[PDB]
Amino acid sequence: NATEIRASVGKMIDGIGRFYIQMCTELKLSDYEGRLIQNSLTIERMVLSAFDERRNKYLEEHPSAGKDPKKTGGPIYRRVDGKWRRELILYDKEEIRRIWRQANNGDDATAGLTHMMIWHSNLNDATYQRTRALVRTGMDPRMCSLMQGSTLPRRSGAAGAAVKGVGTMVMELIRMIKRGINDRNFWRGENGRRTRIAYERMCNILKGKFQTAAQRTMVDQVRESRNPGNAEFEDLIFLARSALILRGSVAHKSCLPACVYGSAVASGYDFEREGYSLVGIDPFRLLQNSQVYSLIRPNENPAHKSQLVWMACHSAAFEDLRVSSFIRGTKVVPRGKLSTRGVQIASNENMETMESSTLELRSRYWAIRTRSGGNTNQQRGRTSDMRTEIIRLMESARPEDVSFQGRGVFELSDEKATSPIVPSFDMSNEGSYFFG
Amino acid sequence: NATEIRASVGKMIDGIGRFYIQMCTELKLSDYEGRLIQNSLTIERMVLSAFDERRNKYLEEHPSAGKDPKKTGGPIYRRVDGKWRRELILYDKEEIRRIWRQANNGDDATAGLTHMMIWHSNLNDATYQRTRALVRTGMDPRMCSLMQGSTLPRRSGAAGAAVKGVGTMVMELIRMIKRGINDRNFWRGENGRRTRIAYERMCNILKGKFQTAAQRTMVDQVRESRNPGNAEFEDLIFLARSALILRGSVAHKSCLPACVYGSAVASGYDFEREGYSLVGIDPFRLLQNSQVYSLIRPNENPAHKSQLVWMACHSAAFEDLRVSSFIRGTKVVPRGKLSTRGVQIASNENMETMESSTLELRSRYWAIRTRSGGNTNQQRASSGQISIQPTFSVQRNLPFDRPTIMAAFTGNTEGRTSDMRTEIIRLMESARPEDVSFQGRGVFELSDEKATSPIVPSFDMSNEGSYFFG
């Protein structure tokens, strides 16, 4: 049944929106200031810093960074008669812990935490990707496309584990392998047993993510090495460059700004009654009547900022630019010529130059975002023997194979997925590559 | 942590200063004679000749050069009632070996050796640069700027290897390549294996010195030649003329005269307690209250000699003249019109003409000297995606950059020639003589100790000449 899942997610987002309502009540912010992305961003890093129970335990025994008992950051942006000012207001974790507890009807609301942390991962992937660490592990910078969910820490659950990319898992496992190579860390002690356990958990997440049998079997055989040394490093690099084309079935969770939920809940649109979905039309139509204000530099233009915000909201920064333009109805500029900077504001930037303006989120069309792979795969002793079939499959692969047969782009006016329209692009080589 | 490094360097320089104190005690020199650069210079060549264990072993089996059992040179300069006299006093190595051993609390003090030999390399680079060898290998004399640390022999460690210039490594590797071309020296014997090993050690020092990925990769591919012949010669010449603009991150170690440390230690300024640094304010403030005497020819002027000594001390002979003038506060004369000669005195020069006088080392300002590079690389490579991920479920093609996909699992033979040149040339064309470097850093005042607030310099004085040679 799907009604129970819809009711659960509706209750969750209703609690999130009511928490947004109460923070707006408590912060004494104006109507416009309640529609600012920066305030929600800072509040949600406060959120993660309050439920990072592992880091809370680590920092209680580590009183450093000066004035850091329970309070971090808090750069609240406020309006005086047109101008803007930031105040470093410090909030302790514990009261916000109870305000959450009262916001979800006595529950912890860890799932909502997973969705907010994933949405932060989505915005991070949209804005900046780290070839720095990618080459710190020595892997080439030609796989920036598999850094989805890279900023997500381990503390997230299965729902968080679903959206992390294959390359993110590759980076996380190589970190553990290099740590176990630097020092003899795999002893029979509890630490070795626990890192072992985390290793097979991440590995069966990996093998669940893939679709073709060959890569699943080679991941199975990579496990057979009780002592991860150097050979497994190139083995899993080969796994990664095979997943470049033999991509894993990774989900795309559609989370939206902290405000969008709050504005919807404030207006009285109860999500429990009519039901809510995370993959269907829902996050599209909530943005059809949503107003969002944002802060922009004197050199930054808002036109690219709105498109980057739509990237962050729908996690389409790793998709083809042509398709995103089709759903937008307007051309989407690649990151090569974006005359904009990161959404977050640096701690040293002055305030006389900063200017607030609206963001456009309206899209002409809507589409389903399933956790499936291209139809091209369906059309098609050690690790090297399977690398042979990897190579022959790569040779069989073509840049022409059309995927996603039987599905299409839909119009906004339809609600039950009745009749789509088939898109068709013949616009030469505009560039289907967000980076470069 | 940085406290441990500061304590170590403080202990080292304290031992050096105490050795200077004991040499002053043993040589029966006066107070003024203990502030002479020449005495410290001769004593420190004695130092290197005593720890040159490789050369010690080579000369024990090679008893030549007449009276040379254990003693070399030793031209000690002394004052009689205003006049000067040199005595060729010969000191054997071994007693000075034990005096060092007692000076560093039972330790060998090889790091201090590295800093003194680097400081000799700094003074040599400041005074004279060898286009003679630069054209002996056939390389043009336009690259005299990359002869930093040229006089440094191989015996120095990693700290010594950090300050050697890119051109110094180029010269050292071309020497080995020419030796291996003259005779079939790369055999499977131990000599070939050891020269091979030294070769990759010098090469990963090189690739550590650079900053941009293209030159690191081409250095990696130069290694793939198991038999260094003629092609690698022009390959590494191209590497050098690329490093002319794509300069390597080479450190600048701030060593000071043998006396300056001794005078500071004698006064009781313990460096272990308050800590010491080699890059920060430290060598600047020690020179703020340091007195130095030097020997000058009857034709030489002391005004340029003091500036050349400041060059040698702070290894700023390869820097822009305008900046050095700004920190000095006075104009720094380029080597074209320096009416002076080398600091060291020739063995045949007479003594009635020689005159001793003070040197000025005070500077109006101070600045940090990091081992970083300046704005150069621009629009060379931005990686870029190779694959795509389906976010929306739309019936569409999945664009794959196939020809690079094949270059990821296999590949042909791009080569080091007619391939990396395009990138090097493209980057050189993108480079401009206008690009300002070192953003976010500035020149500081002496009165500040914690790097609080700098002042931004600005020169509009036409074309005074930012070129020490020529």
Place this chain on the structure above:
Amino acid sequence: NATEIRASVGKMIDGIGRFYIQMCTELKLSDYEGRLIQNSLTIERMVLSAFDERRNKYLEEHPSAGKDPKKTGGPIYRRVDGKWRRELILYDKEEIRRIWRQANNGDDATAGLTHMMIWHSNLNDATYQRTRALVRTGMDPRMCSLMQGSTLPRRSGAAGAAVKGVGTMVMELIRMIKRGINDRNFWRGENGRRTRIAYERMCNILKGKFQTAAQRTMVDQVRESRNPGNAEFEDLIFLARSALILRGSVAHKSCLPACVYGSAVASGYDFEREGYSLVGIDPFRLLQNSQVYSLIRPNENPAHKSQLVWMACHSAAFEDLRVSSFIRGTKVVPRGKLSTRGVQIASNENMETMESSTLELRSRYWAIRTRSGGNTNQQRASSGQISIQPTFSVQRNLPFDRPTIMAAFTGNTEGRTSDMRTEIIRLMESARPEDVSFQGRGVFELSDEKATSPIVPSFDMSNEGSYFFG
């Protein structure tokens, strides 16, 4: 070094004695009631029930036995004006967990746990041995002498594993073998892997316990059976009846009553300073000035109770009665005619009949208790040469023992049956009830502290009976 081990054991027993002091403070018991064995016994079953983390986890998911959340038993015995009364006072585990944590200076003190559980095993072996289980597995009741450390569960560490007898391991392994025979439990799952692991751990404990090479090799070959069926059952029974004479080197850990440590610690005798030992004179001299009170039935006599308590303290219930009498200086009555019962009191016994009195622990002599074996193996195997080397250059054959040369590179299948039996049987026939053991060691006097001069005992008192059971 031995000083560190002595300091560690001294700290451990000091913590144990301080915990005894604090329990005496908290229980509001009198001076006499603090010298009762029963109170310490009940408190120490509370101790084991509080650190039985495996059983704690098993019982949290199994809430049975009525009122059993965290509290078990607790029959505290108290005096009213001469008479005695038991109260079933229930203590939860957790507060005693923290009181331990504060008693060992923030440490868990698991080693002390091992020694107390071993001492409970020692008293259990002294009082009652189970031929019930010995014949439940079908093994004959003739081997009651190898039930040392039988009550010890697996949770003990290596120190606990050292004192468990060979027969205890035989029983534990036969239990696992019968469980694996009843059901197909050796699957490739985690349970099979873990029971496998515990099996080789118990087996290398076994082979470490033995001394002669033949039994070690046959234990090695018993391992080669991946599927323990029926043949291994008689194989290891043969191993056990061979260890009857070819006894294993099993240690004898000298633990003493919960009170004895507490009284010693209360008086201020710090064991860390002067050092402590578990094998030497130490537990002997602490009992030389120790007062112990105990509970005795109206029919039980205290004379045999004191001797049984000395058995339990020094784990000498499996030794020769004559030797124990010699160290005692008084005759030790065997269990055949002991007009006494178990030390522990049944839950239904009335209190008007129960009477408290002192126990005698003074011994005339003292002896070392090493984990060595006695004279047994004789004319079993002397290796011998297999090859020869030509010393003189003489035209002669080179004798090579070829059939063993083929057995050194290859081999058939000798088997564990009809092969090692011959050696075992041969050695048993070579064994005699006359062979004197422990040459070079003797019984010592109390007044000596450094093991200077012993006295050689000599018994010619016919056949008084060197057999505690029967």
Place this chain on the structure above:
Amino acid sequence: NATEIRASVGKMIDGIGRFYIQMCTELKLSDYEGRLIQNSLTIERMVLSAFDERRNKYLEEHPSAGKDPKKTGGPIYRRVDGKWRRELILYDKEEIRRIWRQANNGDDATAGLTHMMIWHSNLNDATYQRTRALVRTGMDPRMCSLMQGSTLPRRSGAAGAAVKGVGTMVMELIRMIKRGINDRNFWRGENGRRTRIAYERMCNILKGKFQTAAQRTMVDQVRESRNPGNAEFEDLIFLARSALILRGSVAHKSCLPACVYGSAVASGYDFEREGYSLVGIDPFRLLQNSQVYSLIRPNENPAHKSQLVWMACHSAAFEDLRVSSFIRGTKVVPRGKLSTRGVQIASNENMETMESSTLELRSRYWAIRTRSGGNTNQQRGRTSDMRTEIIRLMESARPEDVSFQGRGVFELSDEKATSPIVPSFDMSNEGSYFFG
């Protein structure tokens, strides 16, 4: 030329005999007491403890074992009117160092040191062999025959290295391998370089010791492992059990008691003039007119003691018993039923029971002792491939192949090796095995 070697060894043994003469002069011992093996044995451990410059340096920095500045042991045995008494007389090293220096005409006489330490190794091999260490390394006790020169430390030179057995080298190399396995000792430091150097020196000694090409090649390939781990352990165990039959050409150096040389030198028999040899008739004829007294327990018999002393002198404890009996002319009892104990006397044994008597060293015949192997060998990727030829050679080997063709046992009266007599034994299976 061989005259120079003969002159050198004659000068060396003349110096040794003159040092024996001077020790007899200095110790104030009687004529009988100068013919006791125990006195020479103790004096020669004093000798080795005085030239053990490595141990001297190690003990100067390690002042332990109570009163041990420069003096060790010294249990001198003396006669009072028939009875015997031991005195623990302590001699410092340094004066004996100069007395040596004056005894060899200003030279160190390290070669003589090598021969005395080898002769101690010979007596140790004759008396007791250590299966204790042989099984400490885990090797089976079925190779006690290859423990020749086991007690010899590394300090000996090439002459000492020649007589050490193959099994001795196997034990020494396994010790280093186990030490390098326990800790990461093969670093680029000087210690690793020096242990490396000692390793190839011991290995080319090994490959020089062997005769057939297959084992030399497999020893060459064992070297190719830069990191000696576990596989090389069984590799070299296979090497050892192959050398069981494919024995190495190990020399047998004929050293004699400290006294025998002294008595010969005292009588005026200059060895420089007539020449001396270590392999030929020489040590045989010097024992033909040598008188030796020894100490015997009240239960020990002198008949087996004399034979064991002849074993120690001629290092024939690892040879066939039948051949040794033939040269003796009397039956040689194997160690199984020797009702005797070690030659050296324990420090706690009482003196009222001890009795001194003569030893018989006369032999009916004499034979050359070359460093060659049996004629049976002349009649005949990894380590396992060569193990295959090892197995086939072992199968080709027979316990019947007669060796040493063209050589025979000689009579005493002949001096120039003119005519031998061929021995022939048909005495069933008396037992050609000294142990077991």
Place this chain on the structure above:
RNA sequence: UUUUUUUUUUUUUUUUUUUUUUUUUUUUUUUUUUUUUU
């Protein structure tokens, strides 16, 4: 015609043993009592 190198604690009570070693959890048991009974 083939050769003196040194790296943190060992060995002569004796002849084949003896020696700085460790908290894992899987479906119902046990203190009426000492060798049976389920």
Place this chain on the structure above:
RNA sequence: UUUUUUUUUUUUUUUUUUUUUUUUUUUUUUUUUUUUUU
């Protein structure tokens, strides 16, 4: 119909670099001097 584990120091000045690192020796050179000469 698929899920909150914690182990010794990191990160919001910014968008693809920058950062606790080390004594090896092989057949004849060099301080009359500063860019030639052998």
